[PDB]
Amino acid sequence: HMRSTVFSDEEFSNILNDFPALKRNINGKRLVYLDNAASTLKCKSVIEKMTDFYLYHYSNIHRAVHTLASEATVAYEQAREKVANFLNASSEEIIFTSGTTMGINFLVNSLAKSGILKTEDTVLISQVEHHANLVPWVRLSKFYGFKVAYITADEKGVITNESILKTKESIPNPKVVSITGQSNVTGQEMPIELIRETFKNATLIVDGAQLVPHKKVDVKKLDVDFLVFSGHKILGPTGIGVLYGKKALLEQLEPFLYGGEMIDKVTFEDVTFNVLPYRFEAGTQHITGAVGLGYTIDYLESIGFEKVEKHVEELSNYLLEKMMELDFVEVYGPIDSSHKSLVSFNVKGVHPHDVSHILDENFGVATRSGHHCAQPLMGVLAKGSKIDFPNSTVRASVYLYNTKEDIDVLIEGLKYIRRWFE
Amino acid sequence: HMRSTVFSDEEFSNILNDFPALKRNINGKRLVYLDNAASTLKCKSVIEKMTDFYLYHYSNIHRAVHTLASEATVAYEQAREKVANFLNASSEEIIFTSGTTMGINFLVNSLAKSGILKTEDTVLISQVEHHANLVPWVRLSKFYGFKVAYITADEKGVITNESILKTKESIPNPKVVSITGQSNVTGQEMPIELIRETFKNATLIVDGAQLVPHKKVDVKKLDVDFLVFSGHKILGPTGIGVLYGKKALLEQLEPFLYGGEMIDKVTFEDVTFNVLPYRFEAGTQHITGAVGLGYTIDYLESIGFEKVEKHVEELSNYLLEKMMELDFVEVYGPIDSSHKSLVSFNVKGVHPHDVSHILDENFGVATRSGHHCAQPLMGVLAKGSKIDFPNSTVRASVYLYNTKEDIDVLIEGLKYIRRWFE
Ligand SMILES: *Cc1c(COP(=O)(O)O)cnc(C)c1O
Numbered sequence: 079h080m081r082s083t084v085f086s087d088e089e090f091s092n093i094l095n096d097f098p099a100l101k102r103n104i105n106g107k108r109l110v111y112l113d114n115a116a117s118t119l120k121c122k123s124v125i126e127k128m129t130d131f132y133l134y135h136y137s138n139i140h141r142a143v144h145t146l147a148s149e150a151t152v153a154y155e156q157a158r159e160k161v162a163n164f165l166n167a168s169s170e171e172i173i174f175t176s177g178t179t180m181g182i183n184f185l186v187n188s189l190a191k192s193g194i195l196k197t198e199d200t201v202l203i204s205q206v207e208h209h210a211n212l213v214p215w216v217r218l219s220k221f222y223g224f225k226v227a228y229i230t231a232d233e234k235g236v237i238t239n240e241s242i243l244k245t246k247e248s249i250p251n252p253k254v255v256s257i258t259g260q261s262n263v264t265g266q267e268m269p270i271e272l273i274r275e276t277f278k279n280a281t282l283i284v285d286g287a288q289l290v291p292h293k294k295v296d297v298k299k300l301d302v303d304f305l306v307f308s309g310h311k312i313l314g315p316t317g318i319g320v321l322y323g324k325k326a327l328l329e330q331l332e333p334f335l336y337g338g339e340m341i342d343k344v345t346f347e348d349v350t351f352n353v354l355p356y357r358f359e360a361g362t363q364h365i366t367g368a369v370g371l372g373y374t375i376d377y378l379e380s381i382g383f384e385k386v387e388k389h390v391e392e393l394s395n396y397l398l399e400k401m402m403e404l405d406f407v408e409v410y411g412p413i414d415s416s417h418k419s420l421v422s423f424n425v426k427g428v429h430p431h432d433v434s435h436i437l438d439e440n441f442g443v444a445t446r447s448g449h450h451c452a453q454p455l456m457g458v459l460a461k462g463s464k465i466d467f468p469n470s471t472v473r474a475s476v477y478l479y480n481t482k483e484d485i486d487v488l489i490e491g492l493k494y495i496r497r498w499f500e
Numbered sequence: 501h502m503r504s505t506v507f508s509d510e511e512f513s514n515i516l517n518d519f520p521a522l523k524r525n526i527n528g529k530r531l532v533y534l535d536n537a538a539s540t541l542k543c544k545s546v547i548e549k550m551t552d553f554y555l556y557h558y559s560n561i562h563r564a565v566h567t568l569a570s571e572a573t574v575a576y577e578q579a580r581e582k583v584a585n586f587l588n589a590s591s592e593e594i595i596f597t598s599g600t601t602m603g604i605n606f607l608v609n610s611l612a613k614s615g616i617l618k619t620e621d622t623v624l625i626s627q628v629e630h631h632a633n634l635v636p637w638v639r640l641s642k643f644y645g646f647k648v649a650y651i652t653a654d655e656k657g658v659i660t661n662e663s664i665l666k667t668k669e670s671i672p673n674p675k676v677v678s679i680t681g682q683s684n685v686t687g688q689e690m691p692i693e694l695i696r697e698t699f700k701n702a703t704l705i706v707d708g709a710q711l712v713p714h715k716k717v718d719v720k721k722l723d724v725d726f727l728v729f730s731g732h733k734i735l736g737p738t739g740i741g742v743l744y745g746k747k748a749l750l751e752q753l754e755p756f757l758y759g760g761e762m763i764d765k766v767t768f769e770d771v772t773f774n775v776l777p778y779r780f781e782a783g784t785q786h787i788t789g790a791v792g793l794g795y796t797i798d799y800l801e802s803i804g805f806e807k808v809e810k811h812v813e814e815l816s817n818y819l820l821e822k823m824m825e826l827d828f829v830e831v832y833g834p835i836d837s838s839h840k841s842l843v844s845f846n847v848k849g850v851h852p853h854d855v856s857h858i859l860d861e862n863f864g865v866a867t868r869s870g871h872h873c874a875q876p877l878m879g880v881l882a883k884g885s886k887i888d889f890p891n892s893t894v895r896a897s898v899y900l901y902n903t904k905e906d907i908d909v910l911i912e913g914l915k916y917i918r919r920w921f922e
């Protein structure tokens with residue numbers, strides 16, 4: 079018994095067989111893939127469907143008169159609809175992009191050009207944001223003149239409900255609030271609805287890159303204005319992301335990028351724009367990445383996405399339990415049920431890169447060491463550290479095809495690393 | 501005998517076998533794919549390599565933290581080298597993007613943000629430009645205040661050497677010149693060396709999206725400042741493009757997009773940027789797309805790119821001469837050896853969309869009708885037309901896997917339309 083409360087040994091066994099990378103061995107040990115927070119492994123049946131699409135159903139899309147162009151166009155718009163149903167949005171509220179990062183850049187630039195984010199307006203973000211939801215705001219404040227303010231994290235990197243309510247006293251009327259739906263370092267799932275009510279007049283953006291892959295997201299319930307995520311973190315193709323926005327807001331936004339398809343009329347001197355969603359898709363999109371993403375979502379819904387979520391939840395609880403028992407590790411983030419997907423940590427007396435190196439070479443375990451694209455968060459964690467804090471951490475992250483046994487290999491690995499450095 | 505002065509019947513038939521779409525039949529007719537100028541068919545061996553990458557050598561990149569991460573990093577970066585070598589560029593001068601369109605948008609925003617293209621300045625483009633190399637200039641000139649000027653086309657859409665000189669009399673020192681390498685409507689390969697020598701102090705950008713797939717481009721010899729093209733038009737994956745820029749210029753440009761990997765140091769208040777080329781690659785790129793495009797380049801080089809080029813030339817000249825024989829069609833563009841790849845035309849008394857539909861439903865022939873994302877050029881061609889010009893054209897376009905027989909099926913379909921429908 080694989081030790082699941084969610085999947086039978088047969089269903090689960092079938093799932094694992096969908097991921098050929100799991101048959102890889104590193105120095106004679108099976109691959110134990112715990113770097114899911116950076117990117118995920120690919121499903122053979124999904125990738126075969128993309129291959130069939132490239133080889134037999136492919137051409138450029140829209141203005142479709144010939145047979146392949148119709149097929150490709152229909153498949154692409156069908157993919158948009160699968161994504162809209164997955165988020166409870168309408169299809170004209172789904173814009174295909176290159177990724178989360180592009181999505182955030184699209185918003186900052188489009189909000190400023192549309193006249194919504196002005197000089198001396200304030201954008202409020204959190205201290206635990208990924209560079210993708212931090213650097214565009216901080217750098218572009220120098221060109222457009224807005225100010226950036228932060229919701230502060232505690233010395234373990236936690237954004238408490240109290241911090242959220244306290245920030246509102248101090249920054250009462252932010253023009254934009256952009257926050258992570260879940261930290262790629264602390265593992266903390268954020269209280270999005272509490273944020274939405276506390277900053278009732280703000281344009282609210284959620285960085286969904288870590289959240290969307292393992293937890294149900296209903297954009298109407300959350301009442302977010304915009305949400306972004308990346309395909310490659312949900313078993314999907316690279317080069318494909320999603321931007322969701324409220325139809326009423328998208329209708330007033332200046333396009334980020336310009337070119338073909340997004341126009342209606344072009345003259346040498348002026349342009350007008352197409353309707354939604356095409357207004358915000360300039361030139362040839364990642365047609366096959368979109369179709370592939372659609373097929374990824376079909377795969378997840380065939381397993382059943384509530385089961386995906388529960389399985390990841392039980393893996394997360396087990397990972398965090400086992401990590402908390404080790405007396406020679408320091409763990410970051412909340413020790414509560416908001417903590418999901420991943421555990422960032424340091425082994426006392428051992429450099430993070432050595433932890434990841436030995437885990438990989440001697441135990442076949444893939445983890446990541448470093449700042450995890452959250453350099454300012456590291457400075458916050460340093461203040462609460464009780465060790466000689468290396469300004470970086472090790473990170474183990476779980477997803478669909480992981481097991482409790484994978485986690486037991488990680489633990490065995492870490493014990494070994496402690497005994498080896500003494 | 502397949503009528504090639506370039507490939508033996510043996511080699512040619514192996515090349516055809518690489519493209520499974522060619523086995524498709526439309527109402528009993530074999531696919532005759534002549535919409536290459538929109539996008540190209542995919543090679544099975546290439547797509548199998550991409551499949552092997554996705555399933556067995558996949559992870560996020562640029563940090564040597566575990567075995568699959570290193571593999572994936574090496575593969576992506578060797579793909580960057582393959583592109584650099586194909587264009588005779590250094591690898592730090594090659595930036596992966598989502599396509600040609602994102603590439604132009606990058607340049608316009610970055611040139612403005614960097615203080616290079618200012619309110620006083622003029623960008624010179626041509627009247628034949630695709631929307632990708634027209635709309636961003638026109639629309640952003642309204643936010644940034646620079647001026648847009650145009651090299652004029654004659655009434656068949658031809659950009660003559662004399663028109664280029666005449667523009668130089670009125671606009672002797674444009675800050676930026678952005679010009680097509682080859683028009684997607686007239687097929688005219690532009691005289692890039694002439695343009696480079698005539699505007700020697702401008703920042704010269706070439707939109708190579710139609711050109712690069714079938715003609716050797718040596719960026720050092722041409723001495724262009726920037727060049728852009730799209731993967732999907734050179735047998736490659738969707739969602740992937742290339743931007744080439746001279747190292748000395750890339751080093752002074754503000755990045756277009758911000759996020760992970762493109763930074764060096766991030767604080768809550770300031771950022772610094774990574775080295776070339778990563779300065780201009782924000783967040784996770786289309787990893788597998790880049791690898792695929794490398795393998796596409798390998799494939800073209802195993803055939804022999806000079807042979808590809810000569811095959812497309814021989815096909816282009818046959819297409820144009822057979823179209824010139826037909827007294828019921830109006831042909832656009834120059835009737836000389838500058839005309840390559842594609843022929844835009846109208847059938848007298850028949851709407852372009854009906855031509856395309858009849859060709860597809862009766863002859864298996866894929867063509868495109870519409871404005872081809874060049875609406876201002878349509879207005880230019882309207883004045884030279886001798887028929888009731890429908891503000892659109894039919895276009896047939898040839899590439900590697902096409903044959904003189906394919907072109908003969910097109911011609912037969914056009915005569916069927918004339919003879920019977922009528
Ligand atoms: C991965 C991630 C991003 C950036 O995604 P890309 O796909 O690399 O553009 C942003 N935010 C969070 C929280 C992430 O985990």
Ligand SMILES: *Cc1c(COP(=O)(O)O)cnc(C)c1O
Nearest residue numbers: 361362599600601630684709730
């Ligand atoms: C196709 C094309 C473009 C746009 O390419 P995308 O891949 O759609 O970004 C730009 N210029 C010309 C001349 C083209 O043929």
